[PDB]
Amino acid sequence: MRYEVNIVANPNLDQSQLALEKEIIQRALENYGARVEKVEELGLRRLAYPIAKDPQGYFLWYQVEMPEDRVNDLARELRIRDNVRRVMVVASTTPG
Amino acid sequence: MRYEVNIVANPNLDQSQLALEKEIIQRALENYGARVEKVEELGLRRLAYPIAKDPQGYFLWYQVEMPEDRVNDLARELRIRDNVRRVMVVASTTPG
């Protein structure tokens, strides 16, 4: 299945720390057997609506192909790190 | 400011109803004075992570240019309709 993986990392990291976080994510995708189809580094962005107390984050977006039964474990592995604040995974298709 | 507007509509609508919802959104963007730079109709998708009781939705994505002081009112106008389940607006830049 094709998925979009949206990651929000700590906005306060220096680029050396961010490089480590990005490397860890890519290694996790490969280690879980995902085929990585696109990586977009969106960078520092701000949630405007709804209203959050901590609206800034460092946004990363991945498009991947992988089996549905492996997605949950991957997502949880990605978010275990303290510098990964949020992970959201959307399947690009549904049964209907 | 440039914003990404992520809309999740009711996944159970027929295309006649969805056409009305899309027309309403575009009219609201124009009526609020946003410049609409891209419209992507992503269609029926499923939240895979985190786990939601109602994970399916009809996803729409807009990129717009508009003043920051008008975004909140626009977002609230967009979501007042029952068929618009979620609106999320992200500013593409931050002060830092």
3-state secondary structure at position A51: coil
Q: Give A13→chain B minimum CA distance, Å.
A: 12
Phi, psi dihedrals of residue B6, rounded to the nearest 5°: -105, 125
Which of B7, B62, B69, B60 is CA-nearest to residue B29? B62
Residues 6+ apart with CB under 8 A from A12: none
β-partners of residue A7 are A60, A87
Q: How many structural domains compose chain B?
A: 1
The CATH number given to whatever domain includes residue A85 is: 3.30.70.60
Structure tokens at B23: 């027309």
Structure tokens at B83: 């068929």
- Give me the residue label for tokens 């399916």: B56
Find the domain containing B8 and state its range. 2-91
The answer to whether the CB of A87 falls within 8 A of the CB of A42 is no
Q: Which element (helix H / strand E) includes B26?
A: helix B15-31
- Give me the residue label for tokens 């990964």: A84
- Give me the residue label for tokens 């992570």: B49
CA angle A11, B61, A29 (to 5 degrees): 55
Q: Give a yes or no: residue A58 inside a domain.
A: yes
Residues 6+ apart with CB under 8 A from B89: A47, A48, A49, B3, B4, B5, B6, B71, B75
Peptide bond into B55 cis (omega under 30): no
Which of B22, B20, B8, B14 is CA-nearest to residue B55? B8
Q: Give a yes or no: residue A96 inside a domain.
A: no
Q: Looking at residue A4, what DSSP letter applies?
A: E
Alpha carbons B3 and B19: distance in angstroms, whole number: 23
CA A95 vs. chain centroid, Å, equals 24
**In Å, how far are A3, A71, B31 from A32, measured between CA atoms?**
14, 9, 46
This structure was determined by X-ray
Residues from chain A that touch B93, judged by Cβ atoms under 8 A, are: 44-46
Q: Give a yes or no: residue A14 inside a domain.
A: yes
**In Å, how far are A11, A46, A59, B92 from B96, measured between CA atoms?**
8, 9, 13, 12
Structure tokens at B41: 């109709």
Q: Give a yes or no: residue A8 inside a domain.
A: yes
Q: Give a yes or no: residue B96 inside a domain.
A: no
Residues from chain B that touch A72, judged by Cβ atoms under 8 A, are: 48-49
The beta-carbon neighbor of A3 closest among B3, B48, B94 is: B48
CA A38 vs. chain centroid, Å, equals 12
Residues 6+ apart with CB under 8 A from A10: A57, A58, A82, A83, A84, A85
Phi, psi dihedrals of residue A53, rounded to the nearest 5°: -70, -30
Orientation angle between helical segments A68-79 and A15-31, nearest 10 degrees: 160
Q: Give A75→chain B minimum CA distance, Å.
A: 7
Alpha carbons A58 and A5: distance in angstroms, whole number: 14
**In terms of DSSP H, where are the helices of A1-96?**
15-31, 68-79
Residue of chain A whose alpha carbon sits nearest to that of B41: A92
The answer to whether the CB of A72 falls within 8 A of the CB of B49 is yes
Residues from chain B that touch A91, judged by Cβ atoms under 8 A, are: 45-48
Sequence letter at residue A67: P
- Give me the residue label for tokens 């299945």: A1
Residues 6+ apart with CB under 8 A from B90: A45, A46, A47, A48, A59, B3, B4, B6
Q: What was the resolution (in A) of this experimentally determined structure?
A: 1.2
